[PDB]
Each structure stands twice: as C-alpha cells, then as structure tokens.
Design a binder for this molecule. Sequence first.
Ligand SMILES: NC(=O)c1ccc[n+]([C@@H]2O[C@H](COP(=O)([O-])OP(=O)([O-])OC[C@H]3O[C@@H](n4cnc5c(N)[nH+]cnc54)[C@H](O)[C@@H]3O)[C@@H](O)[C@H]2O)c1
Ligand SMILES: NC(=O)c1ccc[n+]([C@@H]2O[C@H](COP(=O)([O-])OP(=O)([O-])OC[C@H]3O[C@@H](n4cnc5c(N)[nH+]cnc54)[C@H](O)[C@@H]3O)[C@@H](O)[C@H]2O)c1
Ligand SMILES: OCc1c(F)c(F)c(F)c(F)c1F
Ligand SMILES: OCc1c(F)c(F)c(F)c(F)c1F
Ligand SMILES: [Zn+2]
Ligand SMILES: [Zn+2]
Ligand SMILES: [Zn+2]
Ligand SMILES: [Zn+2]
Lengths: 374, 374
Amino acid sequence: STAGKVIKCKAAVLWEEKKPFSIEEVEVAPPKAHEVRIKMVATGICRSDDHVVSGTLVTPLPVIAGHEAAGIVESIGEGVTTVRPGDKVIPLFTPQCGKCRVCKHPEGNFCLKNDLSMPRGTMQDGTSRFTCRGKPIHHFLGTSTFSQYTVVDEISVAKIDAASPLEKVCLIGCGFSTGYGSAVKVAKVTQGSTCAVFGLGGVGLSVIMGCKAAGAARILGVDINKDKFAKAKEVGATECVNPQDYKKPIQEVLTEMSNGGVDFSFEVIGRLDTMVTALSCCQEAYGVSVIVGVPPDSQNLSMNPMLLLSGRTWKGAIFGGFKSKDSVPKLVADFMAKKFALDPLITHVLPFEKINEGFDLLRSGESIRTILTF
Amino acid sequence: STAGKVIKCKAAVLWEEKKPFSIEEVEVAPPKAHEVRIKMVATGICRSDDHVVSGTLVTPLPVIAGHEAAGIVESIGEGVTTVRPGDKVIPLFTPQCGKCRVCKHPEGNFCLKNDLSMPRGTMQDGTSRFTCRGKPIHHFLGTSTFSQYTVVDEISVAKIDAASPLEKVCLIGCGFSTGYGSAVKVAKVTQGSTCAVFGLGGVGLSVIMGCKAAGAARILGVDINKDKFAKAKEVGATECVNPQDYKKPIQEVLTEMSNGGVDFSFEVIGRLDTMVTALSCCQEAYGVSVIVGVPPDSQNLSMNPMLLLSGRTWKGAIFGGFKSKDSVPKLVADFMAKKFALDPLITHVLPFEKINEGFDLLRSGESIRTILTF
Ligand SMILES: NC(=O)c1ccc[n+]([C@@H]2O[C@H](COP(=O)([O-])OP(=O)([O-])OC[C@H]3O[C@@H](n4cnc5c(N)[nH+]cnc54)[C@H](O)[C@@H]3O)[C@@H](O)[C@H]2O)c1
Ligand SMILES: NC(=O)c1ccc[n+]([C@@H]2O[C@H](COP(=O)([O-])OP(=O)([O-])OC[C@H]3O[C@@H](n4cnc5c(N)[nH+]cnc54)[C@H](O)[C@@H]3O)[C@@H](O)[C@H]2O)c1
Ligand SMILES: OCc1c(F)c(F)c(F)c(F)c1F
Ligand SMILES: OCc1c(F)c(F)c(F)c(F)c1F
Ligand SMILES: [Zn+2]
Ligand SMILES: [Zn+2]
Ligand SMILES: [Zn+2]
Ligand SMILES: [Zn+2]
C-alpha cells in the first residue's frame, strides 16, 4: 500500500528559467484533508508550460509544471467526497470551489481560489507536497502534472468516465476545452458567420473545431508557419493566410477578405500586436474578438479606443469560459459519445522521460500536441 | 413658398478651434433628391459639440456643429418618402440607411454611411448646403443643428409624434438615448446588479436612468465634481464617490465597495485613463465595461490584456447601440407615455442667440443640458 505514506517517484523539475527539465526523484507527501493524490497516466505539452520555461509566465521556481493531464486516484484525504481511489480524473488548473462569487455566477469560471493571478505555487493551504534533494518544490496552478504522482486540492480535480482513454482525454484538461469553449461559449459564434483564428497550434485548432461546430460559414486561419495550414483545413478552416505573404497589414487583408470585417476573431498566440490586429479585423459595429493567448509578463498593449466606441466587443477567457469541475466530466462524456474528435490535435506520443524532446518539438514548430505517457 | 429656394437664416458658425461661435447669416440651399430641409426648433448642447471647439474631436472647419435637436420639416427633395413638410423630426447623427451590412445586422447600429469615423463634413453626396460670407461651410455628422435651417439626408432624419414637445425630445437625439441605451441595450444591465458610472453629465445621468430601469441594486456614481452628486442620486445613484477624496486609486476603492468588482461599469467622460479604470473596476471574471466617452483625437490607451484574459468584457457604442431611425420615434412615443423623464437633464434654457453662454455654462461645470430655442 502507498496510502498515508510519502511516495518517492519520478518528476520533471524546473530548477530555473530557460533550462531543460530535470527528470529525477521527488518525494510526494500524502494528501491532507480535502486533498487528492493522483497517479498520472498522460500529460500534454501546452505552450503555457513552455511560457514558464521562457519567462513569458512568472511563477515561483523551482517548480513541477504541467497542467493538461489525466490520471487515476491513488488516495484521498479526510473529507473528500467527489472522487475515490481508482477513479479516472482530470486535474483542473482553474479550480471550481463552488462557493465564491464567481463560482455562483451563471457565466463566470475564473474561481477566486485560482493560483493564476497572483501565483503562490502551493496547495490551497499555502504549503507544498513536493520535495527534491531535500528542497521544497513549488506547485503549478494547483496541478503539477509533470510527475508520476501529484497532490491536488479537491476543488482542482474532476472525476471522469471510467472507460475514458486517458492518453486522449488529457487534452480536455486544457487545450481542447479552452479552444472549443472560447468559440462556442465565450464568443458564442453564430451560424453562417465569418471567423478569424490567429494561431493554429493545439488551442487554435480547437477554436476552429468550435467555430465549425457552431456552424460558421467561413473560418480564416492565420499563421506565420504555413506548415500548420493543412491540419487547420482538415478541422474546418475554409482558407488559411500567412501575414508574411502580403505587403499590407493582415488586419487590412482580413477586412478585405471578409468584405468589411469578420464576425468573430480569436487571438490564440500570445502577442500584444496580434491581440490588437485580431480586434481590428472584426467588424467595427458588431464584431467580437476573444483573447485566448497568454502575453508576456507585465507588458501593456497600446490601442485606439475608437475601435471599441464604434461597437466592437473585446473579451478574454481562461479555459474556454467553462466552469471546470462541472464541465470536464461532460466534455469527456461528449467525447466518448463521438461529439468531437481529439486525434487531430495529437501529432506525437512520447514516454514521460522524453519531456525535453517534446518541448523541443513544440518550439521547433513541428508538433501540435505531444502527449507524454508515464 | 421657400420650397425650392435658397433660405437666408442665422446659424452658429465655427470658423476656428478654441473660439466662440459666430452667430451670423448663412445661405441654406434647397434639398436635393432624398434630402430634407428642416426648420430647427430646439437643440441641446452636448459635450461632443464642445469637443469640436476644443479639437478633442477633429472634423473639417469651418463648420456648423450641433447634433442633438428637433424641428419641423420645411421641404423635401425629390424621392423622399419617410417625412413630409410640417412633420416633427429629429436629425439622426448616426444614420440608418437600412441597406448596409450593419443596418441589416440585428445588433449593429453604426451604419456605414456615418460621417463619424472619417469625417468629411459634407452631405452624403460629398457637397455642402451651407454658404457663409460666400464661402462653403462644412456640415457636422450630417446634421448641423446649430442653424435656424439645416439640410439632412433622408437616412439621417426620423419622423416623430406630431404632439411631441420639441424642447424636451431633442435630448432623444443624443444624450438621453446614448446613456439609456448604453445601459439597457449595450451593457444589458441585469436586475440586482451593481453598476459604476464614471461621469455624471447629461449622458452619465442617462446611463443611471437606464441602470435603474433595468433593476440594478447599486448604482455608484463617480465624478470629480461633487456638485453633480445630488442630481445623480435623484435619478437613481445609490452612492456617489469623488476620486479626489481617496488616497487609493478609484478602481481599488470601487472594487472594495463592490466586494470584489462591479457587474457593469461605464466610462462617460472621454479620458483614456478613466476608460482603463472603468474596465479594471468591473469584476475580473464576468464584469462588463462600456466606453461611452469620446477620447481625444488619435490617442491610444495603454492596458494590460490580463484584465481581459480573466473574463472581462470591454465594449463601446455610439448612440446607445440604437438603430437610429427605428428607435428614435419609439423613444419619443415612450417619453409621451411617461416611460422615462427628460426634465432631470435640463438645467438651463436659452435662446439660440445665447449659444456661447450655453457653452460657458457647460465648461464651468454648472449645467447638465442647456436647451437652445430658435
Ligand atoms: N486562455 C487559456 O486558458 C489558454 C489555454 C491554453 C493555451 N493558452 C495560450 O494560447 C496560446 C496558444 O497555445 P498553443 O496552441 O498551445 O500554442 P502553439 O502550439 O505554440 O501555437 C501557437 C501558434 O501561433 C503561431 N504564431 C506565432 N507567431 C505568430 C504570428 N505573429 N502570427 C500568426 N501566428 C503566429 C505559431 O506558428 C503557432 O502555430 C499560448 O499563448 C498559450 O499560453 C491559453
Ligand atoms: N458614445 C456616444 O454616442 C456619445 C453620445 C453622447 C456623448 N458622448 C460623449 O460622452 C462624454 C460625456 O458627455 P456629456 O455627459 O455631455 O458631458 P459632460 O456633461 O461634460 O459630463 C462629463 C462629466 O465627467 C466628469 N469628469 C471629468 N473628468 C473626470 C474624472 N477624471 N473623473 C470622474 N469624472 C470626471 C465631469 O465633472 C462631468 O460631470 C463626452 O466625452 C461626450 O463626447 C458620446
Ligand atoms: O494554458 C492554460 C494557462 C493559462 F491560460 C494561463 F493564463 C496561465 F497563466 C497558465 F499558466 C496556463 F497554464
Ligand atoms: O455625442 C455624440 C458623438 C459621438 F459619440 C462621437 F463619437 C462623435 F465623434 C461625435 F461627433 C458625436 F457628436
Ligand atoms: Zn470559486
Ligand atoms: Zn494550457
Ligand atoms: Zn446602413
Ligand atoms: Zn452628443
């Protein structure tokens, strides 16, 4: 038995920015009250994880990163009612406490217990369950999935279908749900509309999936890497454009293509300039633009508010606007019911021990999602 | 018997920025095809008219300004079908051509025939109906209401109830409709919500009226001029705050007051800083902020897109999001049935000839709306 005992296991520890992950032995404490210790089965490589390495995202180091994953409950602390040992689960990088003003609001999902805004890198109780070489190691978004075992707060885990294929449904933990929800729930893309999607990575392809599902007539994919176009078309893009191909700025190109601006635009990269371009390319009177990408820490964009005064709507969202604990099990059920596909997002499957190679694939432009298997 | 003839009349011509209006004789050409010549009865002094004087709003000079008004049709050009001589009318500074993509859109109102985005200061045919001292004088937003007679395109005029009191209902031509629509139509303020309204002039008061009509539980008025607070409370503000009274920035004060941020905020001033403050003070996950104020020409704001990524919605609107020609007659009908009040906005009345004194009253902080009678 491992319950109630410290587990020694393998994890990918990030000791400092801009270095490879160190794959080594860590100690994982048993869960305290209202906590859940999970044996990880599969975890995806999201660009947000790379942002921690690059310094685009600031979070306390050293850290066990990883937030897009699925595993099986090893044990539960006192008072846990929502999962049991043996359950398949997905860690929730946006928690759902169920009690705060946001959780109580019909539209809101950015639960006040989150560790994104002001990251502490701990459990809810302000402590860490991880040590490595006798040093405490920070958590990441209350998830820390780049480890054979993690411990999460109960509000940061959802029970999912016992028959789920964990090496696919881990994508529901971030990239798929984010993209899909940003289209269907946050933008509320309409039938017959014209959409523009900036960035054709895992998250942008999921936005295309959601736009198609919502009945968009035109879905214009935008990427500087033309190698991304074929897959974008497979999942629903009607045309793809590379800004580098044009003499005019792409907002102008897109406005011309859409005969005066798009209905819905999406920034799915993480650049300040493309956030403004995506806003500008939506129709000035009734267009809607959704920011999905994570921008570099502490940088402000510059924009002319006349873009809004004419009637545009600008919004952003975390995790596709989904209330995480309510939504994740339904999304997995929908997947098992063949309501959407995940395979188009998965280009590579590697053992966990090849985590660095997985990051290199992302950074080189060659992968969409690499799934790491434990 | 003036039909088909040039009319000589008095108008308030602005020859130069930052100068008084010159009340002097102009020549008003008869209406061409699909044009309407109107004998003005009443016009309000809106801060946007002052922006033309101050150079906050750039439009070609010399100009006859004025956009919030009502009058009586003197004559119609060939092919006009929607008004007749003798009809009471309100000029529409935002046209409604009924044919463009925006007019056909269920939500949009910023008709593509507008003269706001890239002002030419002409009629739709790119010419002027006004001469003064033998020189052509520009139009303003297709309306030019600071004149005993004006000529407008058919798409820029609405027929209103023959029994309308024009000295009141002129406010439906800008300030009332803008503020009230910004709350009820653009923001979609909900029952029991908390709203913050920045700027307690004619338009901000109208926002308050709309928030109260929509059932908001708390309506927090924000102004640096505490003399504006009494009237704001009369029309439904539950609390008023002066940023100058506080050591902390007003977004922090308002967040504290609202136990974590407001449901709906409105910028109704025209400052880049208060646009960002207004966004910040809405709840980060589900808050909505609407820009109503007109910013200084060609200036960009700076903001951190994390304010949006958490879930905020930011939008702007012209004329309260109302399709102008459909909406103005209904707004008048509703006023006549006492569905809303206009008297709280009217603080001063003056003859047209005292237009400069009207502007002095606004600039001093003393007036809300001065109504000028011809
Ligand atoms: N809001 C959320 O909850 C959320 C969730 C998941 C991902 N993210 C962010 O979303 C972004 C996309 O993540 P991902 O899909 O995993 O990343 P990714 O797989 O790197 O995809 C990004 C794509 O953007 C393309 N790109 C780069 N620069 C430009 C440019 N200038 N113009 C057009 N295309 C360009 C690039 O070629 C690549 O295909 C990242 O910033 C993530 O951090 C946010
Ligand atoms: N979007 C539209 O269609 C539309 C329509 C009508 C008016 N406008 C604009 O809306 C704004 C308000 O017009 P109005 O009500 O006629 O003007 P106004 O009567 O000058 O009211 C503005 C109020 O803002 C207050 N104010 C000034 N600076 C600050 C500050 N730093 N903090 C808090 N309050 C401050 C000021 O004391 C005054 O009561 C102007 O910019 C107009 O140009 C836009
Ligand atoms: O990819 C999901 C994701 C985000 F959307 C963030 F805003 C963030 F800060 C982060 F760390 C993260 F993982
Ligand atoms: O007050 C209404 C009003 C506006 F909202 C503008 F954006 C503008 F440019 C203008 F001239 C105007 F009069
Ligand atoms: Zn919560
Ligand atoms: Zn992610
Ligand atoms: Zn139109
Ligand atoms: Zn106005």
